[PDB]
Design a protein around this ligand. Structure first.
Ligand code: NA
Ligand code: NA
Ligand code: NA
Length: 135
């Protein structure tokens, strides 16, 4: 129930919706709305994570653990940036189609998103584990 976990949960719920590639998702993927909204949720998650670590350091080998926690935090942020970037890519590939069917592009986006989401989830679990043993 930590603040950064709730923020990550909002990013995660939003991305679970994007995965469906429903009509309204597809509409908002060709505007900047999905990637703008996900970036805001990403930034919030990272901000709350930074503040949580800072407060944990008040209730605490340490050097190694602190560097490993930094690396796990950076992985989470890179994962979220990779998701946003893949969705920016999709918008460009649609435009290149010049009005032609995007069904194949959507099948391919859906399968790639599943794998990016798998990576984000496993990195979030690893980060949560390191935060629990840091404290
Ligand atoms: Na969900
Ligand atoms: Na694409
Ligand atoms: Na296509």
């Amino acid at each position: 129930g930590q603040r950064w976990e709730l923020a990550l949960g909002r990013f995660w719920d939003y991305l679970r919706w994007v995965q469906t590639l429903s009509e309204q998702v597809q509409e908002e993927l060709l505007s900047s709305q999905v990637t703008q909204e996900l970036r805001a949720l990403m930034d919030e998650t990272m901000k709350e994570l930074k503040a949580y670590k800072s407060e944990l350091e008040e209730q605490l080998t340490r050097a190694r653990l602190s560097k490993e926690l930094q690396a796990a935090q950076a992985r989470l942020g890179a994962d979220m940036e990779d998701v946003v970037g893949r969705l920016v890519q999709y918008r460009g590939e649609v435009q290149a189609m010049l009005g032609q069917s995007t069904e194949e592009l959507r099948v391919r986006l859906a399968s790639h998103l599943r794998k990016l989401r798998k990576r984000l989830l496993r990195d979030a679990d690893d980060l949560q584990k390191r935060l629990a043993v840091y404290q």
